[PDB]
Structure formats: C-alpha cells, structure tokens
Enzyme design. Structure first.
Site, PDB file in Angstrom:
ATOM      1  N   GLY A  47     -10.691  51.434  43.623  1.00  0.00           N
ATOM      2  CA  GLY A  47     -10.936  50.039  43.318  1.00  0.00           C
ATOM      3  C   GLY A  47     -10.560  49.727  41.868  1.00  0.00           C
ATOM      4  N   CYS A  92     -14.956  56.420  38.225  1.00  0.00           N
ATOM      5  CA  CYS A  92     -14.421  55.158  37.755  1.00  0.00           C
ATOM      6  C   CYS A  92     -13.298  55.500  36.740  1.00  0.00           C
ATOM      7  CB  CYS A  92     -15.568  54.429  37.065  1.00  0.00           C
ATOM      8  SG  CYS A  92     -15.171  52.832  36.358  1.00  0.00           S
ATOM      9  N   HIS A 138     -18.535  45.530  37.490  1.00  0.00           N
ATOM     10  CA  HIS A 138     -17.633  45.265  36.366  1.00  0.00           C
ATOM     11  C   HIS A 138     -17.580  43.826  35.959  1.00  0.00           C
ATOM     12  CE1 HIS A 138     -15.917  49.170  36.043  1.00  0.00           C
ATOM     13  NE2 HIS A 138     -15.602  49.196  37.323  1.00  0.00           N
TER      14      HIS A 138
HETATM   15 NI    NI Z   1     -15.275  51.205  38.023  1.00  0.00          NI
END
Ligand code: NI
Ligand code: NI
Ligand code: NI
Length: 160
Positions: A47, A92, A138
């Site tokens: 993502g 991430c 985010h």
């Molecule tokens: Ni992230």
C-alpha cells in the site's frame, strides 16, 4: 518513481487535505496515481498513502495479488463494524528494516471516492481491513509504531 519519506520527517505528521472535487477525473490526479503505483510497486509494498511521497492529499492505494483487490481510495472514511480486534504483523516503506505487531479492527466498513468521484462503500475483514486501517492512518499523521501496544513484538525484520 518518487522518494518515500521516512519516519522522522515532519510531513508524515500532517492531517492530509481532502482531494478537491475539481481534481476528480483529471490528468493530474491520474499522474499522481500512476506515480504512486510505480513507486509502491518498485519497492514491493502492499500500500502507499500520498503523504509518504510528500503529497498532502487524502489518497491511498493498495492491492495484493490473502489477496486484496487493487484499489484507489480518496477521502476515506472508516467505520468499525464491531469491537473485535486482531493483532498482525505490519511493516511500512516509511519505516524500513522494521516490523511490529499491531492491533486493529477485524472488520470495517470503508467509504470514499474512486479517482472519478464514484462512491466506494465496502465491508471487509482480516487483512484487507488491516491494510485499509494502516493506510488511512497515514492521512491522520500516524505511523504504526504509534499503534503498537506490545513492544516485545517490535523489532528489525531480519532479527524477527
Ligand atoms: Ni505505511
Ligand atoms: Ni472545491
Ligand atoms: Ni515489476
């Protein structure tokens, strides 16, 4: 291919601005989306949120071929469908080298707009639900370390 901002960078702490409806369906919004796909895909992530490449907009992308459909989500809104939480490992691109276990809602409804301004409204569970929570974090300036409640499960990927 765009530079992914790293944890510590003050831009990741912003509350992202909504995508303006004037930009829905435009070439510029298209270009941003394509850059995001190219960027996510080059570094191998599931993502990416527009703030991680320094763009102050409520726009995220995600897809995993537990598969998750390729999705482009604007101006999202998440609604937990119940109180059940579930822990899972997260990573991430803005926190490279690390993994941490994070508790999220097991089942959510999410809503928003696709890049043409068509409404999105999905109810999803498990991994799909996790990805969506993680990316929408985010847009409110939150990275996953700020969601960890058990620090024994936070560490370097190759060590864990
Ligand atoms: Ni992230
Ligand atoms: Ni306007
Ligand atoms: Ni490739």
């Amino acid at each position: 291919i765009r530079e992914i901002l790293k944890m510590g960078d003050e831009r990741l702490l912003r509350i992202a601005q909504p995508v303006p409806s004037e930009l829905l369906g435009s070439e510029e919004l298209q270009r941003l989306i394509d850059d995001m796909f190219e960027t996510m895909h080059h570094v191998g992530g599931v993502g990416l949120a527009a703030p991680q490449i320094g763009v102050d907009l409520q726009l995220v992308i995600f897809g995993f071929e537990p598969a998750v459909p390729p999705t482009i989500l604007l101006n999202p809104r998440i609604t937990p469908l119940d109180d059940e939480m579930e822990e899972g490992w997260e990573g991430c691109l803005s926190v490279p080298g690390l993994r941490g276990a994070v508790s999220r809602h097991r089942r959510i409804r999410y809503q928003g707009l696709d890049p043409q301004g068509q409404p999105i409204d999905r109810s999803v569970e498990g991994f799909h639900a996790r990805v969506v929570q993680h990316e929408c974090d985010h847009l409110i300036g939150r990275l996953y370390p700020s969601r960890i409640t058990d620090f024994s499960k936070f560490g370097f990927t190759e060590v864990l």
